[PDB]
Amino acid sequence: MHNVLIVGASRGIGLGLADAFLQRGAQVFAVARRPQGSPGLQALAERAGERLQAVTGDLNQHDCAERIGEMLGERRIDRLIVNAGIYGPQQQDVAEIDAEQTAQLFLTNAIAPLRLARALSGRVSRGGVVAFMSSQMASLALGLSATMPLYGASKAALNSLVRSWEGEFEELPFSLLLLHPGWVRLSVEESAAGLVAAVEDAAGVNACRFVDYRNQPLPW
Amino acid sequence: GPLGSMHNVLIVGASRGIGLGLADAFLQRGAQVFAVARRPQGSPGLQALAERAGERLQAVTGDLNQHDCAERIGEMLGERRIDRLIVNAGIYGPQQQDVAEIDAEQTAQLFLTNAIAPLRLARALSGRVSRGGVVAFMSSQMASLALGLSATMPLYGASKAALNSLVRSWEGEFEELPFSLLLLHPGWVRTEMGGDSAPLSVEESAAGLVAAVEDAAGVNACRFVDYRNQPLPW
Ligand SMILES: NC(=O)c1ccc[n+]([C@@H]2O[C@H](COP(=O)([O-])OP(=O)(O)OC[C@H]3O[C@@H](n4cnc5c(N)ncnc54)[C@H](OP(=O)(O)O)[C@@H]3O)[C@@H](O)[C@H]2O)c1
Ligand code: NA
C-alpha cells in the first residue's frame, strides 16, 4: 500500500484525488481545514474506513508540517499532493487588491505550499512524487489568464518556486509535478483519474513536469 | 529625429542604479525625460543630470506603492503623451530569500512592489502612451521558468515571474496591442542590489536597454529580452 498525502481534500479535485487514490489501493491521508464539516470526506471515510485518514490542518499554519509528521509517525510518503488554491479577490483587479489580500493570495498559492512540501520532504520516498496543483493560467507561453490575472500570477509564482526548489538538488530525489486539472465543473472523477495516472507516470523518473490531467505537457 | 520630434520618456524609479543610468542614457539620445523618484531632492545623481540637461530632465516626486502616483505623473505631464514608459523601481525582498521565514507583511510588500503596482501604474497611464510606443517593465532572468536560475533568489524570482504573468495577462486583454510590452533583463549590474561582483556597469546595461527599448518601438509586440536585446525564454 502506497502512502498518499493530499493537502486540501475536503471538496472538489482534492476530494476526487483522495477517492481515486483509494480506488487504486492506497492508504490516503487527507488534510482539510474543517474535515468534520465536509460531507464528501465523511462519506469517503465511512466507505474506506481506516484507509482514509482525515487530518485537521491548515497550510497557512506554521505547525502544519509538524502536525502532519506527528500523525504519520515513521511512515514515508510515496505521493505528496499539495492542493492549495484560492482564487484571490473576486474582481481580479490590480487597482484594488490590498496588502492583506496580496499576502493571503501569494502565501496560500505559492509560498506556503513550498514551505510545507520542503518541511515534509525528508519523509518522501526516494523515487516518489511531490505534486502541486497549479493551472493552465500559470503558463507564460499560453498567456490565457487575462480574465483572472491575479490567480494566474499566483500560480506562475508557485511554478517559479517549484523550479527554484528543483535547482537546490544535484539530481532530483523524487519527481516534482505542477498539475493542471482541466476546467473541472469535465467531472471531478475524470480529472482525478487522469491526474492519478499522470502522477504515477512520474514515479521513478525523478523529473520536473508541468502536465495536465491527460499527462500532456504545458509550456512554461 | 526629424519633424521636430522629441520623445517623452518616463522612468519610474530613477534616483540611483539602473534607473538613473536609463535617465542619463535617454537624455544622451535627445529625449525629454520625466524621472520619477521617491525623494528626487535627495539624489545627487538626479541633481547632476538636472544641472547638465536643465529642463529636458524633469524630476517628479512619486512612489510606485502610492495609489496617487499615476495622478501625480499625469498632473506633471499635462497633455503630453508618453512615448516610452519604463517601470524600473523594485525591491529584492527578504535578504535570506527563504520561503520558510517570509511573513505576511513581507509577502505583500514583495508582490505589490514587484508585480502588482507596476501593472496598476502602467494601466492607469496607458491612455497617455503614444500609439506605437513602448511600455517596459524591469524584470529579471530569475523570472524565467525555462532557465530555472531562480534558486539563487527564489522569492525575488517568483515576484518577477508574477510580474511577467501579469504583463502577459494584460496583453491578452487587447485584440491588437497599441504599444509594445517589454519585460527587460538588465544583466547583473553593479548597483546596491547587484553588488561588487556584478559584471556590468550601469552605463553599459542602460545603453543596451535603451537600444532594446528603441528596437521595439512601432512593432507593438510582447518581448522578454536582455540588455543585448537577446530574447529570454519564459
Ligand atoms: N542590479 C541587478 O543586477 C539587477 C538584475 C536584474 C534585475 N534588476 C532590476 O532592475 C531594477 C532596478 O535595479 P537596481 O539594481 O538598479 O536597484 P537599486 O540600485 O537598489 O535602485 C532601486 C531603485 O528603485 C527605487 N525604488 C524602490 N522602491 C521604490 C518605490 N516604491 N517607488 C519608487 N521607487 C522605488 C529606488 O528609489 P530610492 O532611492 O528612493 O530607494 C531606486 O531608484 C529593479 O526592478 C531590479 O529588480 C536588477
Ligand atoms: Na501619496
Contact B148 A167 (CB under 8 A): yes
Name the residue among A30, A43, A35, A29 with its Cα closest to residue A1.
A29
Name the residue among B69, B39, B88 with its Cα closest to residue B193.
B88
Mutation target to probe the A interface, by most A beta carbons within 10 A, among B68, B69, B98, B99 is B99
Q: How far apart are CA A149 and CA B142, in angstroms?
A: 20
Q: Any alpha helices (H) in chain B, and if so which ranges?
A: 17-28, 44-53, 69-77, 104-111, 117-125, 154-171, 202-215
CA distances from A144 to A70, B52, B85, B171 (A): 41, 46, 24, 10
In 3-state terms, chain B is what percent helix, strand and coil (to 5)?
A: 45, 20, 35
Q: How far apart are CA B221 and CA B132, in angstroms?
A: 10
The range of the structural domain enclosing residue A218 comes to 1-220
C-alpha cell read off for B205: 546595461
B82-87 β-sheet, strand order: B57-61, B32-37, B8-12, B82-87, B129-138, B179-185, B222-226
Tell me the shortest Cα–Cα distance from A168 to chain B, in angstroms: 6
Q: How far apart are CA B41 and CA B50, in angstroms?
A: 11
C-alpha cell read off for B165: 504573468
**Biggest CA pair distance of chain A:** 50
Question: At how many Å resolution was this determined?
Answer: 1.8
Asked if B42 contacts B210 with a C-beta cutoff of 8 angstroms, the reply is no
Contact A106 B234 (CB under 8 A): no
B39 close to ligand 1 (CB < 6 Angstrom): yes
Q: Any alpha helices (H) in chain A, and if so which ranges?
A: 12-23, 39-48, 64-72, 99-106, 112-120, 149-166, 188-202
B138 close to ligand 1 (CB < 6 Angstrom): yes
Tell me the shortest Cα–Cα distance from A4 to chain B, in angstroms: 23
What is residue B44's three-state secondary structure?
helix
CA distances from A79 to A26, A121, A204 (A): 10, 11, 11
What is residue A27's three-state secondary structure?
strand
CA of B13 to the centre of ligand 1 (A): 7
Q: How far apart are CA A26 and CA B141, in angstroms?
A: 41
Asked if A129 contacts A175 with a C-beta cutoff of 8 angstroms, the reply is yes
CA of B218 to the centre of ligand 1 (A): 27
- Chain position carrying cell 529584492: B92
C-alpha cell read off for A56: 485537521
Q: How far apart are CA A105 and CA A97, in angstroms?
A: 10
- What CATH number is given to the structural domain containing A104? 3.40.50.720
Annotate A59-85 with b (16+ C-beta within 10 A) or e (fewer): bbeeebbeebbeebeeeebbbbbbbbb
C-alpha cell read off for B140: 529579471
Number of Cβ atoms within 10 Å of the Cβ of B131: 10
CA of B59 to the centre of ligand 2 (A): 16
Q: How far apart are CA A2 and CA B167, in angstroms?
A: 42
Residues placed in the known binding site of A for NADP(+): 10-11, 13, 33, 58-60, 83, 85, 151, 155, 184
Phi, psi of A135 (to 5 degrees): -165, 155
Asked if A85 contacts A8 with a C-beta cutoff of 8 angstroms, the reply is yes
Which atom belonging to ligand 1 lies closest to the Cα atom of B66? 31
Taking CA atoms only, the protein residue closest to ligand 1 atom 5 is B188
CA distances from B117 to B66, B164, B221 (A): 9, 13, 22
Q: How far apart are CA A39 and CA B16, in angstroms?
A: 58
Minimal Cβ distance to A164: which of B112, B119, B157:
B157
B198 close to ligand 1 (CB < 6 Angstrom): yes
Tell me the shortest Cα–Cα distance from A60 to chain B, in angstroms: 10
C-alpha cell read off for A34: 474543517
Q: How far apart are CA A20 and CA B208, in angstroms?
A: 54
In chain B, the residue whose alpha carbon lies closest to the alpha carbon of A65 is B100
Experimental technique of record: X-ray
Asked if B109 contacts B91 with a C-beta cutoff of 8 angstroms, the reply is yes
Minimal Cβ distance to A149: which of B108, B111, B169:
B169
Q: DSSP code of B128?
A: G
Contact A149 B157 (CB under 8 A): no
What total of structural domains would you count in chain A? 1
Cβ-based burial of B170 (10 A; exposed 0-12, middle 13-18, buried ≥19): buried
Q: How far apart are CA B223 and CA A124, in angstroms?
A: 40
Residues sharing a CB contact under 8 Å with residue B198, sequence separation 6 or more, in sequence order: B187, B188, B189, B190, B191
